[PDB]
């Protein structure tokens, strides 16, 4: 009485094609449980139908044939979680892909867990410094916040994310454990050589130590690409639920949607708007709701997400683009026009927002950039309204004079994340009018000169602004003094 293959805990493949197995049997499987194929290939139970189980396959279905035995696992899909993963490159299921040995994982976590409710969280209040003036000054990001990076191909979306990961060494190399931020970088649909390029740079910046990289690339099965985000999320909740701080980049959520769309159509689920499943909003809401700030009652830890979405022809009104803009706590919109024009980052002031506002900003920063955002918005308008110097008054000549100078200061190169007090020093100079008489073309050069001076000579003012976290009345006076005088010697 060989009773190893009863149809309650095992089944047999009725048919297989395009990564979807229609397994017979599996009478006791649970929706969303993981099953195993004779070939050591894992799959996931998505459709539990009267006469069959629709199984999505986490790998090449070429090794699966009609008749194969499929075995339950009794477990709803999960993955390795914890500090062991830092500095390692894993696939969408947790397996290492840096051929640097097994992960020493002691904890596991379901990839699909609902986000903490109302009661367990507290308003976002601690800054999450990117290192990018434009961002940290105009569209501030706090911990537990979800801020979207969106724009066409090549407008610089990933860069924002890399600079951010790199900027975190400051605190991670420090003492304070509350200021530390562990990062997670999920590649989806991307190309292996690009990711390999990516993890190289992170290594060269001495950032891998605090980063985990979940990779679900271009040739990985649709279901791996699909899962990848939830997988990476779960690894971030480990830190979030244990009073630690995590930052996750979903690069990008566009390719995942495609994966979802594919997986979903191959299951024969009727296509919806634009060919995607009627629940693509849900696909991303479920995920991004998980980035959150827990109250002290739950460890005070947090998860901050920076999902990426690719627009086409800079059209942000597009259905997917707006679907995701309506989930996150703001967006950073990058335009190719601005980029070519010299404005890098190509952040579009007017169209980007932060729903957290200044609550995610240090007082030093709030002090200097409190009204700048709506000022630049109003500047872009009149700059357009006078692309014909229409008998323009002074209040608007002053508006155009600040607008241009401030625009130059928000410019920034790559890989050189600035420290908060450094940002405050340079914005200060502009916002206060000390630069209203310098020539726009000069501004970039001036900022390198000025910053040099204060960093070298004046670290007492930098360390105080940084420390007090505010701009006291004397600091504000020591600063006025430095800028005006250096400026003069500078314009000799």
């Amino acid at each position: 009485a060989d009773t190893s293959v009863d149809l309650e805990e095992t089944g047999r493949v009725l048919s297989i094609g395009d990564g979807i197995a229609r397994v017979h049997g599996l009478r006791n499987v649970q929706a969303e449980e993981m099953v195993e194929f004779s070939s050591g290939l894992k799959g996931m139970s998505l459709n539990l139908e009267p006469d069959n189980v629709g199984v999505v396959v986490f790998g090449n279905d070429k090794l699966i044939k009609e008749g194969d035995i499929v075995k339950r696992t009794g477990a709803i899909v999960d993955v390795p979680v914890g500090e062991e993963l830092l500095g390692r490159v894993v696939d969408a299921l947790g397996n290492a892909i840096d051929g640097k040995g097994p992960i020493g994982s002691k904890a596991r976590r379901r990839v699909g867990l609902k986000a903490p409710g109302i009661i367990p969280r507290i308003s976002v209040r601690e800054p999450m410094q990117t290192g990018i003036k434009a961002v940290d000054s105009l569209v501030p990001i706090g911990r537990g916040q979800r801020e979207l990076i969106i724009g066409d191909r090549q407008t610089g979306k990933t860069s924002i994310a890399i600079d951010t990961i790199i900027n975190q060494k400051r605190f991670n190399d420090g003492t304070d454990e509350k200021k530390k931020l562990y990062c997670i970088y999920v590649a989806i649909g991307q190309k292996r050589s690009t990711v390999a390029q990516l993890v190289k740079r992170l290594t060269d910046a001495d950032a891998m130590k605090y980063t985990i990289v979940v990779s679900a690339t271009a040739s990985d099965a649709a279901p791996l690409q699909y899962l990848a985000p939830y997988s990476g999320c779960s690894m971030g909740e480990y830190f979030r639920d244990n009073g630690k701080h995590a930052l996750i980049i979903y690069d990008d959520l566009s390719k995942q949607a495609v994966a979802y769309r594919q997986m979903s159509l191959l299951l024969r689920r009727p296509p919806g708007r634009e060919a995607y499943p009627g629940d693509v909003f849900y696909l991303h809401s479920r995920l991004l709701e998980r980035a959150a700030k827990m109250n002290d009652a739950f460890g005070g830890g947090s998860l901050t997400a920076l999902p990426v979405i690719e627009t086409q022809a800079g059209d942000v009104s597009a259905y997917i683009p707006t679907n995701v803009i309506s989930i996150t706590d703001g967006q950073i919109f990058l335009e190719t026009e601005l980029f070519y024009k010299g404005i890098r980052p190509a952040i579009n002031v007017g169209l980007s927002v932060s729903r957290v506002g200044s609550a995610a900003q240090t007082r030093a920063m709030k002090q200097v950039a409190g009204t700048m955002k709506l000022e630049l918005a109003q500047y872009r308008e009149v700059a357009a309204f006078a692309q014909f110097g229409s008998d323009l008054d002074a209040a608007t000549q002053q508006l155009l004079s600040r607008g241009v100078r401030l625009t130059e200061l928000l410019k920034q190169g790559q890989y050189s994340p600035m420290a908060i007090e450094e940002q405050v020093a340079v914005i200060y100079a502009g916002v206060r009018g000390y630069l209203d008489k310098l020539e726009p073309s000069k501004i970039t050069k001036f900022e390198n000169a000025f910053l040099s001076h204060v960093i070298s000579q004046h670290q007492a003012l930098l360390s105080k602004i940084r420390t007090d976290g505010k701009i006291s009345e004397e600091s504000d006076a020591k600063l006025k003094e430095i800028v005006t005088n250096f400026l003069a010697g500078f314009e000799a």
Binding site: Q30, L46, G117, G272, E274, S317, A359, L374, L376, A395
Partner: protein, 467 residues
């Protein structure tokens, strides 16, 4: 009755009953679960099998699992002991403060008030917001709708109205969060408390809360509005009070339905929507209403997919409103908040017979000039401004200043604007515009009119700017 699960596909679960088939709308409870899973019966497939929508996650369900017919549609704790509390789609407290000990329970599904139950009183409801008040006045007991694409101000606007109106309101308030951000229910709850609208120690709570956020399965999202609305109907009928209903965002009810629609076996209507969108919306919107028994003042946030106001959903909702505030990313993009579109916002009380001719002539006066300027915009764009008649370059002036005078620093967006929130009284509004239109400020600079409350602040700001 006891049925068994025969198929599970997402939020849709088919159940087979041997004897006694639960009627459509009935709620069934899945046996064997750590948490309460309710399935609402959606259809009779035949063969004593019913197709249902799950009110929560379907993970771990098994074919053959047991299911008991509860014998009635989802019923929730309704009454005064709901105030100051936070409820579920299915009526369970989610605030960790214990049971909700109500005398009665109500089924979330119910018929809408009859035609002979309607009321036609029309009283302006002043809000303190220049734009709304001036051009698209809200009406007490009326149906209000805030339309907007992602991130243009729907919620903040709902936030400042709770402050400028809900806070003084002598009556209850019900805020139903339908498919929105969890972070947000936590911001509001704690704000209600810090301001005593919610009292955790006594019975002075003046607001009940119901939530079915974006982290929920379609099913929950297709019903929270019902739960929310049901709580509100109680205070309207059984107590006869003046209710204030806030829903953010009702689009989520309709997106919820479109998300399971295909699994319900339906040919899609246009834009992917389900073929029953309008009727589904109708039987619901028709309960959110003032009657002779009580009064409801509903403020509903309405999401606009792809920013397209013609999308079957936003498009289908206009007819259910008495006043509409349409927000626009094109306005917002300029830094003009609230980003209301002055030429696409309307109110059923913008009638000389109701608000008066001074109110009315100003409003229309402001709209003509903004329209007049809209038309010229594209043209002075290319052909420039020299050739324009001094008569026409004055309307460009005044328009650009009005465009600004319509913005206002909200008290709930200081974190955003870096400006103290201002609430302007209806007469300060009418007058301010009356004067701009009258040429009484053609000397001050536009910028003086941007982000200010009353017209006097525009005059003061001119000086401050004077250097």
């Amino acid at each position: 009755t006891t049925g068994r699960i025969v198929a599970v596909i997402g939020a849709v679960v088919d159940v087979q009953f041997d004897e006694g088939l639960p009627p459509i709308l009935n709620a069934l409870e899945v046996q064997g679960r750590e948490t309460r899973l309710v399935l609402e019966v959606a259809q009779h497939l035949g063969e004593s099998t019913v197709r249902t929508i799950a009110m929560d996650g379907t993970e771990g369900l098994v074919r053959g699992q047991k299911v008991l017919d509860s014998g009635a549609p989802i019923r929730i704790p309704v009454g005064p002991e709901t105030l100051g509390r936070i409820m579920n789609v299915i009526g369970e407290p989610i605030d960790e403060r214990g049971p909700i000990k109500t005398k009665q329970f109500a089924a979330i599904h119910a018929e809408a008030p009859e035609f002979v139950e309607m009321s036609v009183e029309q009283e302006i409801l002043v809000t303190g917001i220049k734009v709304v008040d001036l051009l698209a006045p809200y009406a007490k007991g009326g149906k209000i709708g805030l339309f907007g694409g992602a991130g243009v101000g729907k919620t903040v606007l709902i936030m400042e109205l709770i402050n400028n109106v809900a806070k003084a309101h002598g009556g209850y308030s019900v805020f139903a969060g339908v498919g929105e951000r969890t972070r947000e229910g936590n911001d509001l709850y704690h704000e209600m408390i810090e301001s005593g609208v919610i009292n955790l120690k006594d019975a002075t709570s003046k607001v009940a809360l119901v939530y079915g956020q974006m982290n929920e399965p379609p099913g929950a999202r297709a019903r929270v509005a019902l739960t929310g609305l049901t709580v509100a109907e109680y205070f309207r009928d059984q107590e006869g009070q003046d209710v204030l209903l806030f829903i953010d965002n009702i689009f989520r009810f309709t997106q919820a339905g479109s998300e399971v629609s295909a699994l319900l076996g339906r040919i899609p209507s246009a834009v992917g929507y389900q073929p029953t969108l309008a009727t589904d919306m109708g039987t619901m919107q028709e309960r959110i209403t003032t009657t002779k028994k009580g009064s409801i003042t509903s403020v509903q946030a309405i999401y606009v997919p792809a920013d397209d106001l013609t999308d079957p959903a936003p498009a289908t909702t206009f007819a259910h409103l008495d006043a509409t505030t349409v927000l626009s990313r094109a306005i917002a993009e300029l830094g003009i908040y609230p980003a209301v579109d002055p030429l696409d916002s309307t109110s059923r009380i913008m009638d000389p017979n109701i608000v008066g001719s001074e109110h009315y002539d100003v409003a229309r006066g402001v709209q003509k000039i903004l329209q007049d300027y809209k038309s010229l915009q594209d043209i002075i764009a290319i052909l420039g401004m020299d050739e324009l008649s001094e008569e026409d370059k004055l309307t460009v002036s005044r328009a650009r200043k009005i465009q600004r005078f319509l913005s206002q620093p909200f008290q709930v967006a200081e974190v955003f604007t870096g400006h103290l929130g201002k609430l302007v009284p209806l007469k300060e509004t009418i007058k301010g515009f009356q004067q701009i239109l009258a040429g009484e400020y053609d000397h001050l600079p536009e910028q003086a009119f941007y982000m200010v409350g009353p017209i006097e602040e525009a005059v003061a700001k001119a000086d401050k700017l004077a250097e």
